[PDB]
RNA sequence: AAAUUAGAGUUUGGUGCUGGCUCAGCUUUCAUGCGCCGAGCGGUGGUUUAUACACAUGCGAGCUUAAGGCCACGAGUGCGUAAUACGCGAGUU
RNA sequence: UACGGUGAAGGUAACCUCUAUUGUGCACACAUUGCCCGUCACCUCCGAUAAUAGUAUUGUACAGGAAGAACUAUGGCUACACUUAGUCGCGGCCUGGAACGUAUGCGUGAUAUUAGAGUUGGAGUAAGUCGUAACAGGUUGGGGUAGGGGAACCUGCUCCAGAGUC
RNA sequence: UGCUAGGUGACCCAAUACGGGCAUCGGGCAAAACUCGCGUAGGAUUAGCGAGCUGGGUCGCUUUUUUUUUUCAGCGGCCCAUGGCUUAUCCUUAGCCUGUCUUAACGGUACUAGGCCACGGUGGCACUGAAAAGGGGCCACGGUUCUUAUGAACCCAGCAGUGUUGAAUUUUGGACAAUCGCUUGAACGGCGGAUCCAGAUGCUGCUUACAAA
RNA sequence: AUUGUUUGAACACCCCCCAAGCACGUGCCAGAAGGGUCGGUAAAACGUGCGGUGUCAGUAUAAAGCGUCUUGACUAGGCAGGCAGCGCGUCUGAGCGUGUGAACACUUUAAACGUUGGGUAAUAUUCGGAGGAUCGGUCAAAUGAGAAUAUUCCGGAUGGAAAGCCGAAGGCGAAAGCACCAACAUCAGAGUCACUAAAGCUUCAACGCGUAAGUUUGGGUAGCGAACCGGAUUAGAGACCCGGGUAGUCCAAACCGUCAACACAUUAUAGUAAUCUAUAACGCCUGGUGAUACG
């Protein structure tokens, strides 16, 4: 018709978490087990994990359960879910697996 | 006898817009936890999805009257290629 | 608390107020102690960028230039067949040179890659902090182009009224 | 050119009687190979194409073969007409189409099987063949081993299987019986990791309490 | 043909979306969540038991593709008003095209455009005279003109800015814009009356116009008004305001070309001045913050 719209429509098929890079679960070491504060109104002390992942590259990842057992040079398994409570971390770390294995009595 | 269009929550003192996020849909993985692994008949499906990475070992093209006669079909992958490609349509020296 | 005896002074200009009535503006509703501003501050996170250590690919200057080799060859060697016994051989098989043709070397270009010296920006963050942009909003602001200031910024000149309001 | 049937043999094999191979001829249909008409990812932070970039003549372009008639191309050498394109070139992504999933449809996007192309660790090249190379030939590269170091041998994008990476990837199974292919004139012959059957493993459709005839 | 009786086991969920609720536990701690979020001492979300809903040898999480999403709109968005009309025009692209567009003769039009000559209310400086302490200025205060004569006032010179009223919800323009005349001058636009029989529409690309600032060149300059020094509401004050005033505003030539350059109303045709809207070519947007750095 009007042949701007004719010539007006393959673009970035967008991955929309872009650190697990089109995949579900990566692996990764934990470079650091370290804890934050949340933006209000929440005010607990979330526990957080950054990943040197299987990628290459370095994201924050969400710990789950009562307490954990990482510490350095440790693996864990990434998976997709995010903790919305700190803004930019999208990363939430599934157990069931390694050295991160599930919590006592649960 | 032609078989053909589902929304909701989320923004604000409330109302309506404005577009975005999410959940409920279908399909999909030797996905990841937790649980069973009774036995049979089957369909099928893996592009070892990636590495066109390095391959131990064994086998895959031998047949036949020393010599000669026949073994370019099958299998795998997508590096390269945006066009001697591929598809469609006409005519062939 | 109650009930009487006497008993006057004294009054309309936003002249503040405490409203209403209202009908002109807000980005306020926790309803102007708001919404919310930035220089910065400790840190965190993808940028953007890059001297370079360079490796991956190609054009071009020439040496080359292997295996091959377009061309060139009659040095051949042999039968077919024809010569009644050396002839003959249009035609089949064989030492020969060679343009060209990789990979390859010091020059010297392209696209591409991460390593990254090193600088700067965006964003994120509960309590370090200096002033009033913004709203009747207190100098009426700004699309524009240049100046001046520890900071928010202001100085002109046409516009737009998408600030109030008689 | 390649197959199948015929017809021929001053050939070879078999024959208590006759058919095969082997050479040649020709009927049938056939592949192959070329050509052009169109389609086709984005990028101006690719704007001129560093080029014969297109055309005309001349040759070279390795065979005559049934009656009136018959045989491509810049592919190379030479002149020559000076033009040809302008999403032209250049970059980077990417095998392509049908498919499969979804949508009500138009569309949008990982497979099924299968169509075609490309490639065989990298690059160059040739023989033969009508047509060229995935376990054929030669050289150079890059790997892997060994040498008394001088040099040789090999190249799983074939099957199983090993190792890295990965969240994840299967049995070093059986078999020529069925196809189908190659081959052989006996022999239900020989071979085939094609395939057919079994495994592990996602999805599925479909049963499942024992006893007893 | 022969005979006996029967519903497992898990996983997730149970505030709303979304079917399903209570107890103790701990009280913005341990925690969960896809979103709204719940916990800040009486938790219908988090520790556990009970009870219930979904699916069932499966179930939830994670991802990925499509749809929902008209969320790139052809079916099927739009673009003053959230985000979206390029500042305007010339324009043989492509596309849409059976009376529009253009030149002539009259009627009528003015701030249309450039050049040349002349003028002006008014302006500050100056040459002599009147006159002897105020003027300037602001809500208010403060450097100075001035004991050499200030505001003023007389009359004279200077030299260029700007066109003071007209003059207005008035005109001309494509837009920016355009406001002393007189003349040259080149248009333009409207109506009447005639020619012409699509030469029409749009503008991708290209290209011009382009208020004002800014720079190069030449000078000199009524008024206007950045620096530099002086004083003020206030604690510092760099601003608003008072006080002198340089480049620039003035001219002639060039470069720049960007902007709430707005009818924020694309252009054109067809209807009665559109935001009533069918079409023709367009240009632009695709949640927000992030457009700055390279080329």
């Known amino acids: 018709a009007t042949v701007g719209q004719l010539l007006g429509g393959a673009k970035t098929r967008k991955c929309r978490i ?3 890079d089109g995949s ?5 070491i934990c470079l650091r087990v370290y804890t934050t504060s949340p933006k209000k109104p929440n005010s607990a002390n979330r526990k ?3 990943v040197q992942l299987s ?6 990842a969400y710990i789950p359960g009562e307490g954990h057992n990482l510490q ?3 693996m864990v398994l990434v998976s997709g879910n995010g903790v919305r409570d700190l803004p930019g971390v999208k990363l939430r770390i599934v157990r069931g697996r ?3 294995a599930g919590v ?3």
């Open 104 to 106: 006592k009595d649960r």
């Open 48 to 50: 957080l994990a950054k």
């Open 18 to 20: 872009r650190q697990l």
């Open 72 to 74: 350095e040079h440790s």
């Open 24 to 28: 579900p679960f990566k692996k990764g």
């Open 55 to 60: 990628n290459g590259l370095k994201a924050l």
């Open 98 to 100: 390694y050295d991160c």
